[PDB]
Design a protein around this ligand. Sequence first.
Ligand SMILES: [Ca+2]
Ligand SMILES: [Ca+2]
Ligand SMILES: [Ca+2]
Ligand SMILES: [Cl-]
Ligand SMILES: [Cl-]
Ligand SMILES: [Cl-]
Ligand SMILES: [Cl-]
Ligand SMILES: [Cl-]
Ligand SMILES: [Zn+2]
Ligand SMILES: [Zn+2]
Ligand SMILES: [Zn+2]
Ligand SMILES: [Zn+2]
Ligand SMILES: [Zn+2]
Ligand SMILES: [Zn+2]
Ligand SMILES: [Zn+2]
Ligand SMILES: [Zn+2]
Ligand SMILES: [Zn+2]
Length: 316
Amino acid sequence: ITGTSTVGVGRGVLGDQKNINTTYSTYYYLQDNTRGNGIFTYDAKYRTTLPGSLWADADNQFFASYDAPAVDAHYYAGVTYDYYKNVHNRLSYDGNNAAIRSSVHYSQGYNNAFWNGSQMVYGDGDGQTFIPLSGGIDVVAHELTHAVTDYTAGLIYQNESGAINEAISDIFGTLVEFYANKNPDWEIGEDVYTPGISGDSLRSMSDPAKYGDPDHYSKRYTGTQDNGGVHINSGIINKAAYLISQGGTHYGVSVVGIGRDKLGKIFYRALTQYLTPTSNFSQLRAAAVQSATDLYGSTSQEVASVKQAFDAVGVK
Ligand SMILES: [Ca+2]
Ligand SMILES: [Ca+2]
Ligand SMILES: [Ca+2]
Ligand SMILES: [Cl-]
Ligand SMILES: [Cl-]
Ligand SMILES: [Cl-]
Ligand SMILES: [Cl-]
Ligand SMILES: [Cl-]
Ligand SMILES: [Zn+2]
Ligand SMILES: [Zn+2]
Ligand SMILES: [Zn+2]
Ligand SMILES: [Zn+2]
Ligand SMILES: [Zn+2]
Ligand SMILES: [Zn+2]
Ligand SMILES: [Zn+2]
Ligand SMILES: [Zn+2]
Ligand SMILES: [Zn+2]
């Protein structure tokens, strides 16, 4: 809508206060004019009709319980935009400043969130498995990263390619969470999963086997469930990424960590320049080695650590 750019204030899903970019035209709308072609957040009103109504608020204060998922969807879309722009010189998910549109209060008791090809969609959870899913910055950025992948490599969502697709979204979801300094960690979805249980998450990148997920290629799932193990086998790549950044010794292989920024640069270059729709784990290794070579040189520590990390998780 047309109006005046304003800054409102509200509280997110976890009760934290934050400022949000809004637009004033009689009402204050969750329309951020400061990022690309805009960030727009919508009320789906517990329906499954999308996108719903552009979020309108009478006073630019967003402290109602019903407001909280919208505050976080809007704010964390903005943080994700800022990450890709400031760290990777990428303008929105398509690199062409596409508007980022999000709908909250999707359906009733809905324990999921997803990028649907044109917008983000967030359930509120059932209050036991999940609280509203936009409360997790890593969830928001994980799903928006699926759009990045779709607009670059086009990784197929099945089998090893699909596990790479998932792991890329976990890697950049995590890197966004660190970029924001929003209680960062190497676990996924901890801020919105099981409010009655502290210390858990959907999966761990630093220790996938904490939740039973494989941390080595020899332990990969080979059946047909979960589209051929896309959220299961992602642990193999997630652990390699963790090792590249943080270092460690894994199945006896010592990895010299090179930090988060270099992890992100290596994997962003691999994703955008080298991966293809059917890349497998071995091809991802090659893409990451080539990317680190492009950036740091073939004789660099960075290249040596990429190789170490993929050796540690059994990916040749
Ligand atoms: Ca209000
Ligand atoms: Ca996390
Ligand atoms: Ca929990
Ligand atoms: Cl460990
Ligand atoms: Cl381990
Ligand atoms: Cl480790
Ligand atoms: Cl180990
Ligand atoms: Cl190699
Ligand atoms: Zn998803
Ligand atoms: Zn995903
Ligand atoms: Zn966290
Ligand atoms: Zn699990
Ligand atoms: Zn798992
Ligand atoms: Zn799954
Ligand atoms: Zn998923
Ligand atoms: Zn280990
Ligand atoms: Zn370890």
